Amino acid sequence: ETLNLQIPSPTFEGSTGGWLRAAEVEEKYAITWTSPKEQVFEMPTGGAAIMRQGENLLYLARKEQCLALATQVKNSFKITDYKVYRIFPSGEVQYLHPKDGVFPEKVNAGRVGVGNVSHSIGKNLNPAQIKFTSKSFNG
Amino acid sequence: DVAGLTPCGESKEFARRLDGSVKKLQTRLSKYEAGTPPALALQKQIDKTKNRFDRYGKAGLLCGTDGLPHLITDGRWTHSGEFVIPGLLFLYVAGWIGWVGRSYVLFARTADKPTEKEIIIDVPVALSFVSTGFIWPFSAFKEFTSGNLIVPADEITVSPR
Amino acid sequence: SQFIKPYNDDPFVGNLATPVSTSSFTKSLLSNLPAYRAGLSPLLRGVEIGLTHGYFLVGPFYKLGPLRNSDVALLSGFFSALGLIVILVACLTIYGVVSFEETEAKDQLQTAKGWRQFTSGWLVGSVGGASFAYILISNIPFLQTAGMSML
Amino acid sequence: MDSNFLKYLSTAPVLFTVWLSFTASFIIEANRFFPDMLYFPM
Amino acid sequence: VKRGSKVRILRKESYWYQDIGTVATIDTSGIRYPVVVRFEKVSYSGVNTNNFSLDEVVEV
Amino acid sequence: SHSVKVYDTCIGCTQCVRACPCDVLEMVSWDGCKAGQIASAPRTEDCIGCKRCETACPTDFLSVRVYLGGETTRSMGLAY
Amino acid sequence: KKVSITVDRDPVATSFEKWAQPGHFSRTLAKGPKTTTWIWNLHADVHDFDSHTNSLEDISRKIFSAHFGQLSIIFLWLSGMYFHGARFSNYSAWLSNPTAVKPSAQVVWPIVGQEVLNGDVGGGFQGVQVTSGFFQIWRSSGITSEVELYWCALAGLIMSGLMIFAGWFHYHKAAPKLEWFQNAESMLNHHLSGLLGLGCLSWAGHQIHVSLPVNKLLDAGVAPQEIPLPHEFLVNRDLMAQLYPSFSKGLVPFFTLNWSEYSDFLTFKGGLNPVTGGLWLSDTAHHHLALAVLFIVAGHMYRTNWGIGHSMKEILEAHKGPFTGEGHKGLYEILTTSWHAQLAINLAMLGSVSIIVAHHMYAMPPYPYIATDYPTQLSIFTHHMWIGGFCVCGGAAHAGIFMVRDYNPAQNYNNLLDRVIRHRDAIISHLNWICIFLGFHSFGLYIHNDTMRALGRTQDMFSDTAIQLKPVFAQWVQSIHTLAPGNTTPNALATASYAFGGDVVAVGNKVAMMPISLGTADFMVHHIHAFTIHVTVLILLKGVLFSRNSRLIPDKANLGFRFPCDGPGRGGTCQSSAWDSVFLGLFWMYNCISVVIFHFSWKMQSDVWGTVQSDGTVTHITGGNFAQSAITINGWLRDFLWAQASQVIQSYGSALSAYGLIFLGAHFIWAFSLMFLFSGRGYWQELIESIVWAHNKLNVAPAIQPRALSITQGRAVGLAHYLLGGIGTTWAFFLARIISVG
Ligand code: CLA
Ligand code: CLA
Ligand code: CLA
Ligand code: CLA
Ligand code: CLA
Ligand SMILES: CC1=C(C/C=C(\C)CCC[C@H](C)CCC[C@H](C)CCCC(C)C)C(=O)c2ccccc2C1=O
Ligand code: SF4
Ligand code: SF4
């Protein structure tokens, strides 16, 4: 499950759009995927890189940067084998996406609904009702 | 006269406006020979200027201290040709355009595809409608009273507040 | 032959190794410069940077200042340089207070004690460099002019 | 005359430009023969 | 209501509140909004149809 | 972070989750709609607030509702 | 013979059916409107051919026929200028007395008192004074008759009919295949050799056989009806040899390479004709003959069907060094498969050429009596500055469209584009720094001078009387160009332009051209120019380089070239598209070009234009106030805008009252634009909801539901009205000012 740090990376001639000091002091994101070919893709941070046949590893500064490459790899090269991780400066590796092995767009058992409101949006409480009280505006 | 104004026919400032306006054109006419096309054009401009001032003087308009005609629009009948009567002509034409357009949008709603009738106008039907506008005050008041102009408040989309 | 490579042999870092960024001449100059010099105390780093900056600050204030045409142009220029040094040393002090949490180690600029030592050195160097510029310009007539003394 | 060319001349920009040019044209002609009408004459 | 009937929307936050649409289908399960109403006017989103409950819909 | 809510008018079309660039939304089983599923937001800390989920929502009033709140490095879209 | 003509015959049927179905060209719009946004979306995407069709062949065919339609419109426009010169002009009166009669080719009808616009332009004529310089073109052509202007109007009309026929024919009857359009070597050979080269050769031939004899007779003092007709020079070689004795030897000196015989009519004089204040037409004839030879020679560079020539792919792929990776590999594939890449290059070049045209045409006036017609000089400079700036921003617009749409990373690995996108942060940060440095060190000098002058400290300013920022390099280059005749251009007789130094050329006691001295004010306004050009480059480049992705939006190419935002999140991504950098850079182009035309207008009036008094003193139009007053912003406000706006404000009741009306109308339109620029769509949609309610109440709601304009369209409408209002304000101000005083 855990990120194999030794995964080889795509051939990129470098760019100025990559990650800055906050990646080494706050958080860094990594994306891995398996490619059947030695093919050119576009980096979210700049120009073009070549993903290697076999397993690739990337280091990006944002989760949207990782998910942008994930969509490019799924719509143009049909890779569904992408795992997105958040790597703390402490060295902790946090797996992110897909969070339970199944894509968010597919239903999965054991998922608990968060943020779900039992009524429609027009039944939200008016702000005057919730003023000077801790009671929430979603009913 | 009204509002301390003077009739334009006896105000000296209107007369000096006419005289100065004709002197400007006569000094432009003084640099051309008699039969030339610019001189003929300038003389017709002088004739139009004199006709305008002559007509305004005998029209019952009231001039200011500046010698320009002023319009009295308080409703008095001795000055109704400056706003009340031109306004009645406007409201007749404006209500014509409004009644004709309203009749066409109500026709276009009953079409097979209502929105093509508004970018590609059914010109024979729309010309039937432009002919309808001459009796719009009666047509629209009968429309109003027969419950066909105003829709009830519970048939109109409104915001939640 | 390629003269531009990924920075630090890391392609996804946000930098490119280039001749301007990573030549041996650039590496030698940065290491030689007091801010990045190895073996240099933070106070000594501040003294060398301060001596440099205070020395060249006097000249624009002296030559182009409001009192430039007056005979007190150098004194005004030195005072203006000194005032700018005091404002900048206040800036260094406040940056040090907010940026760095207090730690025992002082061997680095990026420490509360080290930046305080750096600011101390920068003030001493800047006032000394400004003073050195004042002494030199006052003594040398050519420096008092803009190089037109020969003319 | 072709029905598709007449359906093109019935389009909103063509009718708008022709009708407002006709409208502009009789305002111009009415101000040519009867100029300087500041008032309804009465 | 029933399928194909013309209905007046009573959902205050609807785009077509107090407008007329026509009912396409009504589900029979435990669905929270079974009445599917289609509308001639399109919403700001461009959608011209929405699912509503019975107590948000009146026959005309 | 932002607060993202899903209301029970959700028809389970899965479009808001597909729109999500930051894996904030996912599908959970729900018997309320014909599709048998409703959107959920267990990752609103990654929510940047783009409101692409709202655009993809085909309900008359978006079942998915983003309420922009406290800003973080993640919700500001900062790569620095 | 791999370069061949290949055409599909009868591709598209000439039918009115698609005319009657607006929106037919796209799948979205063809299902009809449901909201009023459709109406706007119809016009917005119509010429976006590569948004409708997948195939490059149909796109290229649509572009070729639309270029013929544009050429038909240009020829109709030219035919109208010739017809208005023939029928509604004082051209014949202007030919007799070019220095007193004012050019006019537009007469108004007397309708609502508007016949005051037929002012007394001279020559027993009343009309609107025209400033396009056509009269000077026609005199340079040797027209000398209104009959020949009618024949030119018919020639333009015939060409307009032939181009509209050719567009119909080449879209509907014989449309070329894609392999025809992808012949860049053949097209370049023909557009260098045939279009530009035979264009110059034929024009040089016309100049030698028509313009040179007629203009020698005109400047000798012969009246226009006493001048022999232009074919009598073609036949009577004896009569042509009276004016130019080299014609006694014919074409033997050309073929025997004895070209110094032709020095009577092929000169290298330089400078201006003293009689007209224009370029020597013998120099212009030699100029066009020399350009024709090089353009024809250039059009033999590329390989088409016989093994001689270059492959442009080989030229590009061979140019690669150690800094630039694979080099120019893949650029030929880009420029023969992307129309937007070609339009980006050609619009940047056409705009640059139009900007070059404005500088060169004022400095070296090329037509007879154009230099002392100051309304024409100001008009054609200002016009070609605006055409240049607009075309340059469209070069960046279509660079953004190329990057968003036609750019493929797979075919662009490690080439020049890949490397630019891979160091775009370094490019934009260094451009950002130079723009901050140059706004501080150009406009802050103005703020320094405003402050010091306001404070009573005139000794503390950047001025010629105080701290002198002299333009030593520009003055030195002026020195070189004044010393160049006889030294570094030994066979030149005069300087390339009198702007560099030298004589004052006066025609009809008005200065044709005279040295433009550069001082502190010129240093300051040139660094203002360098600053405004740099910032326009920064906005346009930042849009091109960040069109596909950023650190902010990593998937910006999926949103497109023209999107409003990607939501209020990430702090807010309003105006994140490449389109919105074209939108923001057209304002800074407006700013740049407005300062350029203001610098030109004030400097030429203050230091160049004016009347030559006895003893050669030149009393200038604004009396040399540029040097001591263009160093402060208050001087630009007071001595340029306030002082020279006198003519537009006081134009009422005269022939220039139309300019006063357009001055006010354009102030109105400019302000009206700010309603679209400072506001947002959501306000207007809720306001429209209340208006829709009032329509619903009267049962008069439209079936095409009214919408507020899109966010992008609100930006585009605001920018279009802003540009129209600002440029129309400057247009009215410039034209009333210089018609009154020059
Ligand atoms: C292309 C450049 C050009 C320009 C800008 C002008 C401009 C002008 N011309 Mg000139 N003209 C031109 C070319 C041009 N002309 C050419 C090529 C010829 C030779 C045929 C002429 C011959 C000519 C003459 C003989 C005269 C002018 C006159 C005029 C003036 C008024 C014209 C007018 O009011 O028409 C208005 C006429 C109308 C019929 C009104 C137009 C309303 C309709 C609806 C136009 C709509 C177009 C249509 C909707 C497009 C779609 C087609 C349809 C199938 C949908 C104006 C200054 C007049 C002038 O200067 O008098 C002093 C004048 O007498 N022109
Ligand atoms: C020597 C031959 C030749 C010449 C003169 C031209 C001329 C032109 N081409 Mg090119 N073209 C050529 C060969 C040539 N082409 C070849 C071989 C190809 C295939 C690879 C193309 C492919 C091509 C494309 C794809 C496009 C052009 C376009 C254009 C026009 C550019 C706009 C312009 O400045 O026009 C104004 C200048 C003029 C001189 C207008 C005159 C118009 C005619 C056609 C010029 C020639 C007339 C005749 C030869 C002169 C006889 C002289 C006689 C009186 C003695 C211009 C008319 C563009 C365009 O606008 O399309 C219409 C365009 O998109 N051409
Ligand atoms: C919106 C477009 C537009 C409009 C309306 C005008 C309008 C005008 N131009 Mg300008 N012009 C424009 C764009 C425009 N220009 C651009 C983009 C360029 C750069 C190529 C120029 C360059 C230009 C020149 C160089 C001259 C004008 C002139 C004129 C005036 C007379 C019109 C005429 O017959 O030209 C006739 C043009 C000539 C008689 C000279 C043409 C010489 C050029 C070099 C021919 C080049 C042709 C070739 C196909 C260009 C290919 C582009 C190249 C980069 C490959 C008129 C004010 C003339 C003027 O101001 O006289 C007072 C003039 O000498 N124009
Ligand atoms: C040779 C020049 C050239 C060519 C062929 C094109 C072609 C194209 N451009 Mg480019 N562009 C150009 C010059 C050019 N443009 C310049 C000079 C600029 C800078 C202003 C731009 C800026 C630009 C942008 C920012 C965009 C395009 C787009 C487009 C495409 C479709 C445009 C469309 O359908 O509009 C149809 C035409 C109109 C809607 C006309 C309205 C424009 C103004 C408001 C009218 C002007 C009126 C008049 C001049 C002044 C008003 C007078 C008043 C008093 C009555 C098409 C590929 C768009 C696109 O789809 O990208 C693919 C796009 O987003 N271009
Ligand atoms: C007159 C109004 C005005 C001013 C002053 C500015 C100023 C600036 N713009 Mg803006 N802009 C404006 C109008 C203005 N803009 C408008 C109307 C638009 C409409 C679209 C834009 C669109 C726009 C874009 C799209 C871009 C700019 C950019 C810039 C910067 C240029 C770099 C520069 O010159 O830095 C120098 C700073 C100045 C010249 C500001 C004036 C300061 C003077 C010199 C004195 C300084 C006073 C001093 C600090 C006093 C300190 C004491 C006090 C604090 C107590 C700068 C911040 C560019 C940018 O930021 O990138 C570099 C850029 O890309 N602007
Ligand atoms: C006024 C305004 C509107 C409302 C404007 C609308 C709905 C335009 C409608 C104007 C009428 C309906 C047509 C305009 C016709 C003009 C008389 C001339 C138009 C010329 C071309 C359209 C042909 C917006 O929708 C908007 C959106 C985003 C930012 C700013 C704004 C904004 O400022
Ligand atoms: S889009 Fe709206 S409806 Fe479709 S799933 Fe997400 S929330 Fe439920
Ligand atoms: S806002 Fe953007 S990120 Fe937050 S949920 Fe909706 S889509 Fe996913």
Residue numbers in the entry:
A (entry chain D): 3 to 141
B (entry chain F): 28 to 188
C (entry chain L): 2 to 152
D (entry chain J): 1 to 42
E (entry chain E): 2 to 61
F (entry chain C): 2 to 81
G (entry chain A): 11 to 189, 192 to 754
Question: From the publication, what sentences describe this entry?
Answer:
Photosynthetic cryptophytes are eukaryotic algae that utilize membrane-embedded chlorophyll a/c binding proteins (CACs) and lumen-localized phycobiliproteins (PBPs) as their light-harvesting antennae. Here, we solved four structures of cryptophyte PSI-CAC complexes purified from Rhodomonas salina (Rs) cells grown at L- and S-phase. The R. salina cells grown for six and 12 days (corresponding to L-phase and S-phase) were harvested, and utilized to isolate PSI-CAC complexes. We then solved four structures of PSI-CAC complexes purified from cells in both growth phases, containing either 14 or 11 CACs, and termed them as PSI-14CACL-phase and PSI-11CACL-phase for L-phase models, and PSI-14CACS-phase and PSI-11CACS-phase for S-phase models. Comparison of the four structures reveals how cryptophytes adjust their PSI antennae in response to the different growth state.
Consistent with the trimeric organization of CACs, both PSI-11CAC structures lack one CAC trimer, but at distinct positions. PSI-11CACL-phase loses the inner trimer-e/f/g which attaches to PsaO, whereas PSI-11CACS-phase lacks the outer trimer-l/m/n, which links to the inner layer through chain-s. Accordingly, PsaO is untraceable in the PSI-11CACL-phase structure, and chain-s is absent in our PSI-11CACS-phase structure. While PsaQ is also absent in our PSI-11CACS-phase structure, it binds to PSI-11CACL-phase at the same lumenal position as that in PSI-14CACL-phase. RsPSI-11CACL-phase and CpPSI-11ACPI structures also feature an exposed PsaL-PsaO-PsaK side without bound CACs, implying that a similar PSII-PSI-CAC megacomplex is present in the L-phase cryptophyte cells. We thus superposed our PSI-11CACL-phase structure onto the PSI part in PpPBS-PSII-PSI-LHC structure, generating a hypothetical RsPSII-PSI-CAC model. Our hypothetic RsPSII-PSI-CAC model showed that the arrangement pattern of PsaQ and the PSII lumenal subunit PsbQ’ is almost symmetrical. When cryptophytes enter the S-phase, changes of physiological conditions inside the chloroplast, such as lumen pH values, may weaken interactions between PsaQ and PsaB/CAC-i, resulting in the detachment of PsaQ and the reorganization of the antennae of both photosystems. It is likely that PSI-11CACL-phase constitutes the preferential form for the potential RsPE545-PSII-PSI-CAC megacomplex formation, whereas other populations of PSI-CAC complexes simultaneously exist in the chloroplast, where they may facilitate the dynamic regulation of light harvesting of PSI under different physiological conditions. The micrographs were collected using SerialEM v3.6/3.6.1 data collection software on 300 kV Titan Krios (FEI) microscope equipped with K2 direct electron detector (Gatan) (for PSI-14CACL-phase, PSI-11CACS-phase and PSI-14CACS-phase) and 200 kV Talos Arctica (FEI) equipped with K2 direct electron detector (Gatan) (for PSI-11CACL-phase).
